[PDB]
Amino acid sequence: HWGYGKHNGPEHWHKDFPIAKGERQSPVDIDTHTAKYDPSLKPLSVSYDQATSLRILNNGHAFNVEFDDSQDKAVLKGGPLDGTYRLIQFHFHWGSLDGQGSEHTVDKKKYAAELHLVHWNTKYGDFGKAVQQPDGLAVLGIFLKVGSAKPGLQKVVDVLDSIKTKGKSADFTNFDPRGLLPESLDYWTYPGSLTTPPLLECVTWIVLKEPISVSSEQVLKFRKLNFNGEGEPEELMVDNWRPAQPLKNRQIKASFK
Ligand SMILES: [Zn+2]
Structure with missing residues (x-):
């Protein structure tokens, strides 16, 4: 099945998911000089005050912090x-x-x-x-x-030992995703896709210009996760990224000058 190894990584995905070679695939390289300011954008509204986190899951390719979306x-x-x-x-x-x-x-x-x-x-x-x-x-x-460390990330980091392997989940209530945002909401946007199979071309991407900072120790804890299930050979969950895909007939727009 698909993954991030040599034998099953991004360069193989097209065999099961031909849309991997489609017209609006993600991710892309953002060429900051060619992106164009778009006056018509509206201000971004991120309304996370009433968020209800529920659970964290190691799905074998990443960990998902899941929310009540009902x-x-x-x-x-x-x-x-x-x-x-x-x-x-x-x-x-x-x-x-x-x-x-x-x-x-x-x-x-x-x-x-x-x-x-x-x-x-x-x-x-x-x-x-x-x-x-x-x-x-x-x-x-x-x-x-x-x-520097990201303080609002630490609660995530410290539950990762409970979800080391594929298929493990843990309760993860009352996590505030506001603690993961940078100061600025300036962004680039373009039409694209899921970055994992099935690679469906259903995404409006909004990529923030300002990065957040995490500590060495925090990222090192990400790197202790496993792609494998418990009782299978240990393979560290690292390098779980798809590389940049061709931009094709798309323009990236900027919210800022
Ligand atoms: Zn992703």
Whole structure:
């Protein structure tokens, strides 16, 4: 099955998921000089005050912090978006080394990791229906660099030992995703895809310009996770990122000058 090894990594995915070679695949390189300011964007609205986290799951390719998405509790609106998008989960992609790990790049620069806050358009009723639509999802992407600790990340880091291996979950209530955001909401946006199989072309990407800083120790804890299940050969969950895909007939827009 697909993964991030030599034998089953991104360069193989097209065999089972031909949309891997599609017209609007993600991630992409963000060429900051060619992105264009778009006056027509609306201000981004990130409304996370009423968020209800539920659980954290090691799904074998990342860990997802899952939310109650049965009401409009944690929603994204504005920016390029029409309508209301509900937070369903967030997860990260990260490297084996601090010099790689992000999926998007900025002028070819790779960050140590990238946070994806995944939201679905409430007009489509559930996530599964939303991923079948061209405007089904909105994913807020945030780069991570290594420097100072991120205090709002620590609660995530410290539960990771309980979900070391694929298929493990743990209760994860009362986590506040506001503690993962940078100061600025300036962003780039473009139409793209899921970055994991099934690679569906259903995402409006909103990638923040300002990275967050995490500590060495925090990223090192990400790197102790396992891709494998308990009782299978240990394979560290590292380098779980898809590289940049061709931009094709897309323009990246900026919210800022
Ligand atoms: Zn992701």
